[PDB]
Design a protein around this nucleic acid. Structure first.
Ligand SMILES: [K+]
Ligand SMILES: [K+]
Lengths: 115, 64, 64
DNA sequence: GATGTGGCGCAATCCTTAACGGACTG
DNA sequence: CCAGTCCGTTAAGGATTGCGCCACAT
């Protein structure tokens, strides 16, 4: 716990801010050339970012498959229907929606979707 | 009177705005009504046009 | 912050208000047009009816 | 001259979303 | 532990909206 609290937190060189087109670019190039894995390694090519951050940034924003379109009504029906069954099993529900990440649904549900 | 000018104006601005907020709602509604009306009318013009063209052909079918 | 917070908000505000001003301009337009054709169809309906009526008198009043 | 509108900035609030920080799997 | 995943939670900041000061058209 001690080493993890330091190596992954206190280190003052850990950039935890916004992503610049370049930063996002390096990740897209790499992930496109060597695949969406080995994030610890890929991260080494990014000053300040750790593998987890890169992974999360790719799966939620840079991956081309990720749709950035407005939520349709069909998707909503699926989500609501599925949530009644599974609950907050975002990952699970995510499999039912073509290009939506678990995070997208989690967000959509927690705001827009809750009446 | 400046104080008065203000107090009065702030009251006017609210009235002016409530008015416009209503006008906009009323307007959005007319769009529904009309579209609906316009729909039934376009229907009626079709209908009548048929009845008319029919009645005409009917006449054009009577012998001298 | 404050200084930038304000600058940034003011942009958002101008933006939001503009959007609204436009939607209300469209709706105001969509009504006019809908009122134009609506008036047109009304006339077309009047015409056809008259004709239908007239034509029918002529027909009922035929020889026998 | 007095009153009605359209703009605008301020602030408090409503709304979304990115992504951090634990926790779990194999 | 390691590399991947998952998920609750929340800061960050854009979108709204009520209030009042103003310019100035009516
Ligand atoms: K790195
Ligand atoms: K998916």
């Amino acid at each position: 716990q001690c080493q993890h609290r330091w190596q992954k937190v206190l280190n003052p060189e850990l950039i935890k801010g916004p992503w610049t087109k370049e930063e996002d670019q390096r990740v897209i190039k790499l992930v496109q050339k060597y695949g969406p894995k080995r994030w610890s390694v890929i991260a080494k090519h990014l000053k300040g970012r750790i593998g987890k951050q890169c992974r999360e940034r790719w799966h939620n924003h840079l991956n081309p498959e990720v749709k950035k379109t407005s939520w349709t009504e069909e998707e909503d029906r699926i989500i609501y229907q599925a949530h009644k069954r599974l609950g907050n099993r975002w990952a699970e529900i995510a499999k039912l929606l073509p290009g939506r990440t678990d995070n997208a649904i989690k967000n959509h549900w927690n705001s827009t979707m809750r009446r | 009177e400046y104080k008065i000018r203000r107090e009065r104006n702030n009251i006017a601005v609210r009235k002016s705005r409530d008015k416009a907020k209503m006008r906009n709602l009323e307007t959005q509604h007319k769009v529904l009504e009309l579209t609906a009306e316009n729909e039934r009318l376009q229907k009626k013009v079709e209908q009548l046009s048929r009845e008319l063209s029919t009645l005409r052909n009917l006449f054009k079918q009577l012998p001298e």
